[PDB]
Amino acid sequence: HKSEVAHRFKDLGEENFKALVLIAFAQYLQQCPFEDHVKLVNEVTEFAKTCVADESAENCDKSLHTLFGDKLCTVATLRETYGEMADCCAKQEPERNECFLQHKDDNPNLPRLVRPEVDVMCTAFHDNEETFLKKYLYEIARRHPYFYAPELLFFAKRYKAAFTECCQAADKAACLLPKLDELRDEGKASSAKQRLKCASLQKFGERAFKAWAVARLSQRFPKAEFAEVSKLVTDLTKVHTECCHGDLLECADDRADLAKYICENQDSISSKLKECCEKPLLEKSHCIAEVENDEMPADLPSLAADFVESKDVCKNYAEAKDVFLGMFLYEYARRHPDYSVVLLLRLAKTYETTLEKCCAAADPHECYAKVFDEFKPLVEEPQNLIKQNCELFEQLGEYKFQNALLVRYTKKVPQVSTPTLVEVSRNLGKVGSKCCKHPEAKRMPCAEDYLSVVLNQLCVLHEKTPVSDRVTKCCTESLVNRRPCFSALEVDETYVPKEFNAETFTFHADICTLSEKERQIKKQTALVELVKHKPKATKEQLKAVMDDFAAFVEKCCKADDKETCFAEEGKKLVAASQAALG
Ligand SMILES: CCCCCCCCCC(=O)O
Ligand SMILES: CCCCCCCCCC(=O)O
Ligand SMILES: CCCCCCCCCC(=O)O
């Protein structure tokens, strides 16, 4: 066109336009004050309007990149607030922007964001909802500089809706709070999955990512043709590459184009792309990305036919080893939307391995014959894992469930810090409630989805401060094998118990007046230390100590005399127990 600005303005809309302009400036200039950005966004929104009136207007022709970088350098403090960054402003653009991208901090040093009181929020909301929302958007944006802007703007709207529906309720806290807590987990998972994808794309390479994308796309569009899927796995991979790099404009467009393409060729891909394809430009890609699995064709051959019996398996495989393996995935994946992608990748690598051992010997069509027999154990393991954990989560609550995990993982890796153990066992438990809620069909995939980021967080920390060689083995190990590795660790027999400390087992009646949250975290932290001290304790010897401690609290946090019963009856328990546990 002529005016790239006008086009995007007209396209996006004043409302979404200003929101994104802010998020953008916020992600680059993570240090300037809110008041500073609003001024920028306004100066910018005013310009764009100029172009929407007359495209020939000065600069209305300039490239978005050029215009953007021009304003960033309009920041005087730049040199003292950012210093080195102010140096980028001295280059021709290809480099100037490339320069900017570099000085983007992934993990800056800002004060953790504290959640005000429901009523303080609801009032701020009502008084001036624009600057209240804009201000909070600016706070999130600057802390997560690589979060895909449009997706962030999409959470924003989900936030604006919780306050709208809740701030008008009798019990605003019972309404809002459980909503903010959810939005928080989702937003945190989302940012972790993005970061996780770029990490793997660089660590493991284009091949692995393409293999992942194939199995992934085959489950959703089981009707599209492998040629169609390859077309998409190719573009898709190009999209993450650019998005990961950091350029929002490039990333934004790449996503736009691929979304349009998918829509025009709807029929060739899936039947469920109905809604997503009618939605506006800003929601299309996101919608499609979340879309539901199209139904898998009823009449289709068997796999053993084309991949087990066939005496060409080796001829076609050697002709092009990757295109053939991708076919196996495409074929196996669209037949199993109930499998986790990592399970699929686990099979493809098992197939690839035997295919290499058999196409090089006597009579292969007989070497790789008992291959599907090798898949059984691989499949049965995660399945049984889900069954056993969802069946137990049904016997004990989410809390009494998390505790069981606590015991399990502390015995596996006692070395791990206690606050870390709790955080992890906590998260895992939550994964237990959102996934065990689906039928045997959507379980495995649900689990892998959450587990991935959870497990990755565990490694990200451990990375910073290693503590166990065992976690490091599983963590730096195969991404496809991370989970299995951990489920594999056995009770650490090496580990030498920690010296007793009653201070660590000194509870004061304050626990009587603590939110169910702090109450648990309190009892749960003790539980961890308890096992770190006596790791050979049984579930019997432990269910006992836990139950005794159970009634105990009811006896003093409800007695006319409090902190006494907590010091007299307590002295008795730490004693009875100390002995009960050899
Ligand atoms: C912002 C990255 C923080 C990582 C935390 C991931 C959220 C845990 C997922 C969940 O249990 O709901
Ligand atoms: C294992 C091959 C690496 C491909 C990267 C896939 C990362 C997706 C992580 C997830 O969301 O679960
Ligand atoms: C230190 C954190 C403990 C790691 C737990 C990893 C989860 C594996 C799932 C399971 O087998 O239950």
UniProtKB/Swiss-Prot annotation:
Maturation and modification: Glycated in diabetic patients. Phosphorylated by FAM20C in the extracellular medium.
Entry-annotated residues carrying Phosphoserine: S3, S56, S63, S271, S417, S487
Site positions (Aspirin-acetylated lysine): K197
SUPFAM superfamilies given in the database record: Serum albumin-like
Mutation effect (R112G): In Yanomama-2
Positions of Ca(2+) 2 binding: D11, D253, D257
Tissue-by-tissue expression: Plasma.
Protein's name in the database: Albumin
Species this protein is from: Homo sapiens (Human)
